[PDB]
């Protein structure tokens, strides 16, 4: 099961809009509870990563409004309504459906 | 608060291997199963397996089934990965973390160099 995302890196200013997408081979939806089994990470540069969104678009405690996972089945999104400073990061979307727990390559915000 | 330390980083020989400890603390030991992940120099993470303490379920990824062991010592809350026969492959962070998204505590890497 593959998880590829896009881009790989990109440069925004702080302030404006950014998606990034994450595809897989393989529907992440479990119709046992209805549920997308996809997660965001943000890693910072010597920092361990964190979790930022669970079942594709559920916040975890502490994390801005300003990111919002969406998407179902095979086709899923991460947006940041308006970059900050403190948002320069790689994302990564990881399978949390099956065995093994594959992440995507991630996307690498960079700022001007 | 939760903390997971783990093993200073290691500078190792090809064809030599290592053992990184994760020091668990702050949570019963034995609820979260212990998760570990390695961080590609450039950009990159692979899950390469993790170790349910109390039920002994241990699942690794077929792409480390050879490389990696996952141990654990119950009496002193400790998670052990043997990683053998590194290559410069192997040169990396690797990260131990609690469970898959319902806790989200994670080890402050260990760098591993092999030259
Ligand atoms: C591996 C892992 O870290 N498990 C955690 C994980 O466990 C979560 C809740 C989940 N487990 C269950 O649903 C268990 C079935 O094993 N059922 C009940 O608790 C009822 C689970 O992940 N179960 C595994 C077997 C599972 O569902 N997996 C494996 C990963 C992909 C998934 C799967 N679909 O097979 O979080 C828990 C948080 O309280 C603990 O921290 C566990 O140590």
């Known amino acids: 099961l593959v998880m590829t995302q896009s881009p790989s890196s990109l440069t925004v200013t702080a302030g404006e809009k950014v998606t990034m997408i994450c595809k897989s081979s393989?529907?992440?939806?479990?119709?046992?509870?209805?549920?997308?089994?996809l997660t965001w990470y943000q890693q910072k540069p010597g920092q361990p990563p964190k979790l930022l969104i669970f079942?594709?678009?559920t916040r975890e405690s502490g994390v801005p409004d300003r990111f919002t996972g969406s998407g179902s089945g095979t086709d899923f999104t991460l947006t940041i309504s308006s970059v900050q400073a403190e948002d320069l990061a790689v994302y990564y979307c990881?399978?949390?459906?099956?065995?093994?727990?594959?992440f995507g390559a991630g996307t690498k915000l960079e700022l001007k | 608060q939760v903390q997971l330390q783990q093993s200073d980083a290691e500078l190792v020989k090809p064809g030599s291997s290592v053992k990184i400890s994760c020091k668990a603390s702050?949570?019963?030991?034995?609820?979260?199963?212990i998760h570990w992940v390695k961080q590609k120099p450039e950009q990159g993470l692979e899950w390469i397996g993790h170790?349910?303490?109390?039920?002994?379920?241990?699942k690794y990824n077929d792409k480390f089934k050879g490389k990696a062991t996952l141990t654990v010592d119950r009496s002193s809350s400790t998670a052990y990965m043997q990683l053998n026969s590194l290559t410069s492959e192997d040169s990396a962070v690797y990260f131990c973390?609690?469970?898959?998204?319902?806790?989200?505590?994670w080890g402050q890497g260990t760098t591993l160099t092999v030259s």
């Open positions: 170790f349910s303490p109390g039920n002994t379920d241990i």
């Open positions: 990881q399978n949390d459906y099956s065995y093994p727990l594959t």
């Open positions: 393989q529907s992440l939806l479990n119709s046992g509870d209805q549920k997308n089994y």
């Open positions: 702050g949570y019963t030991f034995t609820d979260h199963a």
């Open positions: 973390k609690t469970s898959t998204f319902f806790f989200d505590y």
């Open positions: 079942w594709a678009s």
